[PDB]
Amino acid sequence: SSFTTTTSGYVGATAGDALDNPVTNGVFISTVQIMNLQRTIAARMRDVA
Amino acid sequence: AGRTRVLVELGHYVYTLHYYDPQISLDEAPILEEWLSKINPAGIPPVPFCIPIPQVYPCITARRVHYAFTSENNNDSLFSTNAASIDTAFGENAAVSPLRWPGLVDPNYRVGTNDLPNRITLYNSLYRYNFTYPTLDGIMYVRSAT
Amino acid sequence: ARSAVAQCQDAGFLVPRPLDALRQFDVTSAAAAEIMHAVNDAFKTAFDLDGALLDGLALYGDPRIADLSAAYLQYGGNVVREHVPPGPSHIHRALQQVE
Amino acid sequence: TYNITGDGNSFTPTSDMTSTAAPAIDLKPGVLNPTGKLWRPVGTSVATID
Amino acid sequence: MAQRQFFGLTYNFYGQPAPLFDLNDLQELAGCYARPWTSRFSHLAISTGSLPVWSARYPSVASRNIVVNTLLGAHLNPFAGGQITSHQGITWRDPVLSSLAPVPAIQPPPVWAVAENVLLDSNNYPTYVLNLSSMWPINQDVHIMTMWALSDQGPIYHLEVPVDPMPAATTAALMAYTGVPIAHLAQTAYRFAGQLPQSPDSTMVSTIRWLSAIWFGSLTGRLNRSRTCNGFYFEFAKPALNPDQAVLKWNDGARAAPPAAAQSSYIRCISPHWQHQIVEVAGALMSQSVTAVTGLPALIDEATLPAWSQGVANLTGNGQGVVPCLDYNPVPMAAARHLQWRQDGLITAAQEAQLNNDYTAYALTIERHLTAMLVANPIAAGRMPIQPFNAADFGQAGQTAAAVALAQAMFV
Amino acid sequence: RFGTIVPRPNGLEPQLIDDGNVPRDIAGDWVYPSDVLQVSVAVFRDYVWPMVKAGRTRVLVELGHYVYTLHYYDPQISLDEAPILEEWLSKINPAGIPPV
Amino acid sequence: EGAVNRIVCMTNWASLGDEGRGLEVRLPPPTDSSVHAYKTVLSRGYIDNAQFNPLALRSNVLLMLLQFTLSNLKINKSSTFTSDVTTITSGRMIRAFEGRPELLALAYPGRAVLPTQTKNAQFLSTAIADRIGRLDRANLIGGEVSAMVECMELCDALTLHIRETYIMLLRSMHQDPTQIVQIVNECANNLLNSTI
Amino acid sequence: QCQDAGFLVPRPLDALRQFDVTSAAAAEIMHAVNDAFKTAFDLDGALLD
Amino acid sequence: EMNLFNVARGNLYLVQTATNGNWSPMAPVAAPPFVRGGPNVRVVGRFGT
């Protein structure tokens, strides 16, 4: 949940589509963040093996 | 005594109010008769709006014959009914308008919010000031030695 | 006069506030003045001090007295402040102890 | 936590209660998406929608 | 004084076929008014943040600011045109631009010059340059225009602290005004500067500039009751709701450290909230007056600027004075100020800092929601009586803390 | 709180608006913060004294401090506190309080 | 507090000034015929006291409004202020009008205590009480009186607005010593001399 | 507001039925407005007249 | 804010109302056929005839 951080603006697949749709104050996750999150989970798993 | 509902295109106009005893049988007809006959190619008399008083107690019914009804609500000028009373029942009405004192009423309002042209606020921050009028000849000292 | 008054209003002058539970409204500038004038006066009479050109004028504008001190200002950007402390206060100590 | 070496403990295997954990999860690419990346009107105010 | 190439920049349109207003709005303007001079506008602005800034036409003070500019922008293209144009609503009441006239009868031939997004050089138009005297009051107005219009943000305000030779005469006078809010001082200043075709007499000029600093310095944190410009700071009256009105205050604490010689900044506000902040706006109007007198370092370099307002004449560059603009979001600054204050130990954060940050959070919210809701209408109808701007623009970023730090170091 | 009272109009239960807004019958354990006693004079006079006198109504006259006056009698003759009671009540001013 | 109550347009009705401008717009309760206010200008031809000329109406109203404005061009001046430490007031800073205590009540509803559980009471008891009288006074100059007071008062926004404007106009014209000095020195062409 | 002028003004009371204002009438209105000012600022000398 | 100046809005319809209850003349909930597109709501502005 801590990782799932607020994103506020437009929602769409392409600029195209996204132009039409704005979605205020939802949530994103970062490449970096998921990197490090996964890293943890994987590690956890390999500790339990 | 029949029924020809007569529409009097007036736009805007002035009104003279009457207050009467709700517990009795009234007819508007002499009043309006007067109005009617009074009308001149060159002038109009104020509009007769006779009304029964709001009453604060379970009382009986009486016959109430009125004639004049208006396209628009004009009731805005009425500041309060009964006030110093426990219940308004017969002839029920409304009380004071809180919109009149937004800031005093409601803690939300920092007493200088754009109220125009909706409502005239009656209680807010008044600014009062202390300014002397000094002479132009006084502000400065003279040098007579010229 | 300092110590007394500071028990009348919420002032950050250095004194404990023993009499905190005894009923009192948070006094103003104006009110403080009025009390203080009493203080003044009492002192006057007690010590045969009839000259009102003694202590009098201490309540001529914000009598929220905490640290009474004087300074000089020099044009080359600087100020010389003389903070003159009182040391011994026997009366004051006796008052406190009485409280 | 409780002393394991105590009395009262049931050994009731039932069909109802068939062992399970979470062995693996679905990670199909298709499934990763939902959906829209978040964007902004250039960076200036309510005008640049384009 | 007559800065020959007095070239001024008219506003762009938000992906609009037309300049920013509809016909009805412009009608309102021209017609319900008369003079091309800021009297009317200032009348509104002056009323010490009492009256709500909202109206059907005019959402904020700043709103009106913007339609004032666009009005200008459109109607100048007429008479400032190459061979003189003027019709559709406006056919100028005399060549000397006296008054906003609804089309003189037997006068069609000067067209309505359909321009796009275009700077103009006042002095290149023979009528304009003939009337150099009467040109002067309007140039002031012009600047105001340009210096909002340049960008898509809150106003580009200029600062100046000339250190050391400080007139004793300035001191003396300025002290008499102690008690009044920045607003009214500004008003008098503008009025004077207009009323007299502008003087080389640095008096006025210096004064405004010092004032601007003291305000800014105050607003930042740098300047306060205990750290003064000799006595000078601006006091933020009423510590509850966000209306904390900056009055000029003279108290002797310390005389803050004289900077090295000549310190210059320019600020902009990235956040639409600027709109309801008469303080911010009033500095920007101050810095305009300054401009009329002085040939300010060639305007905030195109690095922070939309494409339409790049490569402008002799305005944006790359290797001049003040290459980057100092940028803020108003609510984070208040926090900044409290920071400094606390760092100095002026005050406990305990209750003071908490409380006001609470109120300004509220004020943000209110503002944000109103500005958005109002923008909805123009962002659906052909009419625009308001600053154009996306929800992402409100963002707590835009170099806010850097600005603050620069302002501070400036004071060293 | 005093002022937060509801009469007894046409059979209605004589009530009070109990702190956090509760219409409740006048009997119970009523508290008067000093300043609130000093407010509702005439109304409070009229209402509580009877309920005191001829029922159970446990008035908590929240004082904190007070200046005190003493009186000495004999446990030999039949006496009632009414006179002094009424005087007390008669002599409370919105801005004031007697020696108790 | 009675049965029927209204509001009515009475110009300066609560003016406690020794200054009389004498162009005031006074209107009667809608209960009574205000006919005369609206026939003043052009009803020359239509002598009959009961009746007014409808066509003449926009004109006549327009003047009335004009005069409403004009008999309101007024410097709201500070009187004095009292530190109301009492039961009725939360240590509140009331305008002590040198005479007629009446006015205070009307100016400050909030002051009033609650004997009944009535319609009016109800209203008053649902509103924010603290905002009565003077929140802040504005002077910093030590040993001088205030430049202004900031007081929550029974005050008419529209009228306020009028008066506000007027003040802003006055302020615009107002000049400081230095500039005055200039003006004179210049006019004097140094032949004549004044003490700066 | 009673007469068509060359002048942008706001016009609010257009629903308020008024006669076909002449020149004469406008002149009447002007004088009274003019006398109003004169009164108000306590001025003997000629204004507008 | 016109009714503060004793000025009122609209047109009058004059109808026989012989009733038991408080229909305020001042506040009419104006849904009768007060209008041109009204059922049997006929206009007469002709002169003399």
Side-chain angles (χ1 to χ4, degrees):
Chain A
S1 52
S2 311
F3 299 60
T4 56
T5 24
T6 59
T7 201
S8 198
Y10 293 82
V11 195
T14 60
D17 60 59
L19 311 160
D20 299 56
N21 184 69
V23 173
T24 47
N25 207 110
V27 288
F28 87 86
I29 199 150
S30 157
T31 59
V32 184
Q33 289 175 280
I34 40 149
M35 203 302 177
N36 296 111
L37 181 67
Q38 304 169 95
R39 168 191 82 50
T40 1
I41 288 179
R44 283 171 176 279
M45 298 286 219
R46 340 161 188 104
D47 184 60
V48 76
Chain B
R3 213 63 305 264
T4 330
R5 199 181 181 161
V6 298
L7 204 172
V8 203
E9 290 192 81
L10 288 168
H12 304 333
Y13 59 88
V14 283
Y15 59 115
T16 212
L17 292 161
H18 318 312
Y19 288 91
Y20 73 103
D21 197 295
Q23 202 49 106
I24 62 88
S25 294
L26 182 126
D27 206 326
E28 276 176 331
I31 317 147
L32 174 70
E33 175 173 59
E34 295 160 56
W35 201 76
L36 266 167
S37 58
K38 264 187 185 109
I39 311 169
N40 204 268
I44 285 163
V47 157
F49 270 6
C50 202
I51 192 163
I53 310 143
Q55 288 287 258
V56 308
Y57 57 96
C59 86
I60 63 136
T61 189
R63 262 148 304 116
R64 289 169 274 182
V65 194
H66 300 183
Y67 289 72
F69 306 112
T70 173
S71 57
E72 288 102 278
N73 294 282
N74 296 280
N75 58 298
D76 56 96
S77 57
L78 169 64
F79 134 73
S80 39
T81 78
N82 310 267
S85 297
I86 65 155
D87 175 273
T88 322
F90 198 92
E92 175 184 67
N93 266 242
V96 284
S97 173
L99 313 170
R100 317 173 189 127
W101 329 267
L104 200 84
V105 177
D106 169 341
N108 291 68
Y109 291 106
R110 316 109 284 101
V111 283
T113 61
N114 179 52
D115 288 48
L116 307 171
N118 196 95
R119 186 69 210 171
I120 307 151
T121 330
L122 293 166
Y123 190 107
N124 192 95
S125 178
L126 221 170
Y127 294 91
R128 280 179 183 288
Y129 303 88
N130 290 325
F131 298 70
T132 50
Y133 216 100
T135 42
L136 287 81
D137 289 23
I139 64 95
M140 292 200 291
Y141 301 73
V142 299
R143 203 173 76 183
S144 320
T146 54
Chain C
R2 300 181 206 193
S3 59
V5 88
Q7 191 63 109
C8 291
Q9 41 168 108
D10 285 79
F13 180 66
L14 191 61
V15 71
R17 260 180 132 234
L19 304 183
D20 268 18
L22 178 60
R23 318 197 58 212
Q24 191 62 37
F25 84 106
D26 179 66
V27 305
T28 59
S29 315
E34 204 166 280
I35 316 147
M36 190 300 205
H37 198 262
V39 181
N40 166 91
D41 283 346
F43 252 128
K44 268 173 110 294
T45 45
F47 295 92
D48 64 67
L49 305 175
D50 297 279
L53 223 80
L54 300 178
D55 305 304
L57 278 148
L59 49 148
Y60 289 64
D62 197 58
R64 277 176 168 185
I65 63 152
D67 202 326
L68 185 105
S69 309
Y72 58 95
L73 188 73
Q74 187 208 120
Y75 165 111
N78 285 262
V79 59
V80 296
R81 174 131 184 111
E82 295 282 64
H83 253 327
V84 198
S89 33
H90 291 229
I91 315 306
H92 178 338
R93 292 181 185 279
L95 206 84
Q96 267 61 29
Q97 207 288 294
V98 174
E99 184 179 2
Chain D
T1 187
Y2 57 80
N3 159 105
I4 72 133
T5 59
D7 62 287
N9 59 10
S10 182
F11 176 98
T12 48
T14 54
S15 55
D16 182 261
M17 287 174 187
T18 305
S19 297
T20 197
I25 55 71
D26 200 44
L27 198 86
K28 201 171 69 174
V31 154
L32 296 145
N33 191 231
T35 194
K37 167 73 175 80
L38 199 134
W39 309 81
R40 286 328 300 174
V42 174
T44 56
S45 48
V46 183
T48 36
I49 317 149
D50 71 279
Chain E
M1 299 303 290
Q3 305 184 86
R4 290 296 173 150
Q5 80 316 286
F6 270 142
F7 47 46
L9 173 59
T10 81
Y11 201 36
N12 168 258
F13 336 132
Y14 199 58
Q16 238 259 51
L20 318 166
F21 50 80
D22 79 278
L23 208 56
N24 303 67
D25 187 3
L26 178 98
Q27 181 212 326
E28 274 34 283
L29 275 146
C32 280
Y33 299 160
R35 308 171 290 244
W37 307 283
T38 209
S39 90
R40 293 186 204 84
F41 186 28
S42 181
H43 292 329
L44 196 58
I46 60 89
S47 299
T48 55
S50 66
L51 194 57
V53 303
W54 296 302
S55 72
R57 209 56 264 180
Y58 304 156
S60 65
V61 174
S63 292
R64 204 176 153 210
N65 200 115
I66 297 155
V67 290
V68 164
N69 154 42
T70 59
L71 188 86
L72 296 171
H75 70 44
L76 299 183
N77 286 273
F79 261 64
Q83 42 61 259
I84 299 155
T85 78
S86 207
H87 69 199
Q88 164 279 140
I90 304 304
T91 308
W92 288 112
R93 200 174 318 160
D94 205 296
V96 295
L97 302 146
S98 81
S99 189
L100 296 150
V103 298
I106 49 159
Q107 277 58 65
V111 300
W112 198 59
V114 293
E116 274 170 91
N117 46 274
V118 65
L119 178 284
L120 301 151
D121 187 85
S122 33
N123 301 53
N124 282 156
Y125 314 124
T127 42
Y128 281 46
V129 74
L130 284 149
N131 62 234
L132 199 111
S133 54
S134 315
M135 199 191 98
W136 240 152
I138 187 96
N139 243 83
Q140 302 168 51
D141 287 320
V142 167
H143 320 160
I144 312 160
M145 169 184 83
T146 317
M147 297 198 169
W148 188 60
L150 182 73
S151 188
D152 45 280
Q153 282 64 13
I156 304 92
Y157 176 190
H158 169 81
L159 285 305
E160 206 64 70
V161 231
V163 189
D164 316 273
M166 194 282 164
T170 287
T171 320
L174 200 47
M175 226 97 57
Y177 257 176
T178 315
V180 310
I182 30 81
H184 170 53
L185 53 145
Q187 294 70 40
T188 61
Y190 94 80
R191 270 161 198 217
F192 297 131
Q195 278 155 228
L196 173 75
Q198 73 256 51
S199 176
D201 184 15
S202 54
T203 66
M204 197 176 53
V205 178
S206 60
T207 315
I208 298 144
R209 294 178 314 201
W210 319 134
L211 292 154
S212 181
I214 305 149
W215 184 61
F216 162 94
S218 256
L219 183 77
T220 47
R222 204 69 190 198
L223 306 153
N224 62 71
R225 93 303 165 124
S226 287
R227 307 174 80 207
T228 77
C229 196
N230 306 283
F232 291 127
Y233 72 91
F234 281 95
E235 197 216 291
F236 298 80
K238 216 266 289 77
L241 197 61
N242 141 271
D244 286 75
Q245 306 304 343
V247 172
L248 179 81
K249 263 285 146 316
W250 184 265
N251 307 142
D252 276 103
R255 282 77 286 111
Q263 290 305 329
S264 180
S265 61
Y266 294 83
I267 41 161
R268 56 196 227 171
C269 192
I270 41 87
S271 188
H273 307 313
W274 72 257
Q275 298 169 66
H276 299 5
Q277 294 309 308
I278 63 169
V279 268
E280 292 194 37
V281 183
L285 180 76
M286 293 192 165
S287 59
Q288 303 313 302
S289 79
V290 181
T291 326
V293 186
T294 187
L296 303 179
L299 269 52
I300 312 307
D301 291 342
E302 52 216 284
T304 55
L305 285 183
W308 71 281
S309 185
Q310 296 193 302
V312 215
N314 298 141
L315 282 166
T316 70
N318 42 37
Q320 63 218 67
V322 190
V323 181
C325 201
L326 289 73
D327 266 65
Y328 72 107
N329 183 316
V331 169
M333 190 183 256
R337 165 201 308 151
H338 277 70
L339 185 53
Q340 193 199 316
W341 288 18
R342 226 305 161 89
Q343 303 167 271
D344 301 317
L346 295 174
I347 190 60
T348 52
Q351 35 49 277
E352 197 59 77
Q354 274 59 261
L355 257 70
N356 196 272
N357 309 313
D358 305 331
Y359 291 122
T360 51
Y362 311 138
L364 173 130
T365 310
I366 46 119
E367 305 171 299
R368 195 187 174 193
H369 87 48
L370 303 153
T371 53
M373 172 285 162
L374 259 316
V375 87
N377 332 248
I379 316 307
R383 67 161 197 145
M384 210 175 275
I386 196 166
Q387 183 200 8
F389 70 92
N390 61 100
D393 295 297
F394 292 111
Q396 277 66 51
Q399 187 247 73
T400 315
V404 195
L406 296 152
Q408 300 168 293
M410 307 185 183
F411 273 91
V412 180
Chain F
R1 249 201 70 41
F2 279 89
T4 47
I5 58 105
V6 176
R8 67 176 46 130
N10 206 57
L12 281 144
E13 293 289 278
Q15 314 155 105
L16 197 144
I17 296 285
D18 292 14
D19 316 52
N21 219 89
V22 187
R24 275 296 70 231
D25 266 293
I26 291 163
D29 278 45
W30 310 165
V31 199
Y32 296 81
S34 76
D35 285 27
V36 116
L37 189 102
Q38 292 176 256
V39 177
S40 272
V41 286
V43 180
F44 89 87
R45 193 271 80 188
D46 167 76
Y47 246 85
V48 79
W49 182 259
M51 292 283 174
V52 173
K53 303 314 284 69
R56 209 65 307 274
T57 54
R58 298 171 61 64
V59 177
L60 217 169
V61 205
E62 199 79 48
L63 308 179
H65 285 92
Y66 55 92
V67 172
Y68 77 87
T69 186
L70 299 175
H71 312 325
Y72 305 116
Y73 73 83
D74 70 266
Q76 285 68 49
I77 51 99
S78 289
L79 67 122
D80 195 288
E81 285 198 338
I84 64 154
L85 292 179
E86 303 209 88
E87 297 146 77
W88 175 266
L89 315 180
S90 187
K91 276 307 299 70
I92 307 158
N93 170 331
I97 212 63
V100 183
Chain G
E1 288 193 289
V4 192
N5 326 261
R6 261 180 281 100
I7 50 171
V8 67
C9 172
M10 279 157 166
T11 304
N12 302 301
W13 70 308
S15 182
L16 182 83
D18 297 269
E19 307 79 23
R21 208 185 190 150
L23 279 309
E24 263 61 16
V25 186
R26 324 277 295 180
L27 192 67
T31 10
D32 299 299
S33 320
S34 53
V35 68
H36 66 78
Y38 328 110
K39 61 192 258 182
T40 37
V41 86
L42 258 153
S43 195
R44 317 194 185 109
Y46 325 89
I47 58 168
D48 184 301
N49 281 126
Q51 63 89 92
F52 75 86
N53 188 306
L55 311 164
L57 206 65
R58 204 201 274 194
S59 30
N60 233 97
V61 171
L62 235 160
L63 203 82
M64 303 158 69
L65 305 167
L66 170 72
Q67 285 160 345
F68 177 84
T69 317
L70 306 185
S71 47
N72 270 120
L73 310 173
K74 299 185 191 180
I75 297 158
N76 274 116
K77 199 186 171 297
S78 172
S79 184
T80 211
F81 271 91
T82 47
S83 58
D84 297 276
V85 287
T86 77
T87 48
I88 39 72
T89 56
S90 56
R92 293 286 61 246
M93 252 289 210
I94 297 322
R95 219 202 182 248
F97 323 91
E98 53 44 90
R100 293 141 298 296
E102 300 63 42
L103 303 168
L104 295 166
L106 280 58
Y108 317 99
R111 300 185 67 170
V113 284
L114 262 60
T116 50
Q117 308 79 15
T118 43
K119 310 176 110 208
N120 201 97
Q122 292 174 12
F123 166 85
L124 275 153
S125 197
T126 67
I128 196 64
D130 71 273
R131 305 115 188 257
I132 303 294
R134 198 238 84 188
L135 305 307
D136 295 291
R137 200 172 205 228
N139 191 50
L140 234 150
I141 277 120
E144 161 163 302
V145 290
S146 204
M148 301 170 64
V149 289
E150 297 78 67
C151 53
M152 277 289 275
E153 281 319 325
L154 201 98
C155 187
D156 185 335
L158 185 92
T159 308
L160 185 66
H161 180 335
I162 290 162
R163 302 292 182 187
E164 70 184 296
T165 54
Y166 153 84
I167 297 147
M168 187 72 63
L169 174 82
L170 258 59
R171 184 180 197 197
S172 302
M173 179 177 71
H174 103 309
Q175 291 314 298
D176 307 69
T178 55
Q179 62 249 63
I180 303 159
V181 204
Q182 308 176 213
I183 306 300
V184 176
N185 152 253
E186 285 173 84
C187 279
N189 298 259
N190 264 89
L191 291 151
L192 256 95
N193 222 38
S194 188
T195 312
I196 311 119
Chain H
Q1 247 260 251
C2 290
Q3 290 273 233
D4 279 78
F7 304 155
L8 170 75
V9 299
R11 273 189 151 236
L13 307 163
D14 301 72
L16 197 72
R17 171 204 181 220
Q18 179 71 26
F19 66 79
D20 197 74
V21 192
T22 71
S23 48
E28 284 132 46
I29 292 160
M30 183 297 205
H31 238 268
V33 175
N34 185 52
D35 296 302
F37 262 83
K38 287 170 175 282
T39 61
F41 289 79
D42 182 26
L43 197 99
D44 213 106
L47 198 98
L48 282 177
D49 198 306
Chain I
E1 312 285 64
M2 296 185 191
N3 280 283
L4 295 76
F5 318 91
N6 317 355
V7 191
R9 310 178 256 65
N11 302 318
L12 302 168
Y13 229 161
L14 310 176
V15 64
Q16 197 86 305
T17 47
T19 201
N20 276 194
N22 56 257
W23 78 148
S24 186
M26 284 277 289
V29 237
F34 276 101
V35 285
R36 322 293 63 82
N40 230 89
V41 185
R42 300 297 148 251
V43 292
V44 194
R46 279 144 184 233
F47 324 93
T49 47

